[PDB]
Amino acid sequence: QNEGHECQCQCGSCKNNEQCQKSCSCPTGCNSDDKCPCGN
Ligand SMILES: [Cu+]
Ligand SMILES: [Cu+]
Ligand SMILES: [Cu+]
Ligand SMILES: [Cu+]
Ligand SMILES: [Cu+]
Ligand SMILES: [Cu+]
Ligand SMILES: [Cu+]
Numbered sequence: 001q002n003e004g005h006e007c008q009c010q011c012g013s014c015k016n017n018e019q020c021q022k023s024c025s026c027p028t029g030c031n032s033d034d035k036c037p038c039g040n
Pocket of ligand 3: 007009014017018019020021022023024039
């Protein structure tokens with residue numbers, strides 16, 4: 001909850017909401033735009 005990694009996500013909810021680019025809860029398999037369990 002208070003730790004993340006690096007959301008270089010270019011998804012549709014990552015490219016718009018950059019408020020999670022420092023705490024996105026996704027594994028190293030978030031390369032698709034329909035498998036992103038991020039903040040949104
Ligand atoms: Cu991310
Ligand atoms: Cu994403
Ligand atoms: Cu993110
Ligand atoms: Cu994420
Ligand atoms: Cu992603
Ligand atoms: Cu994600
Ligand atoms: Cu993300």
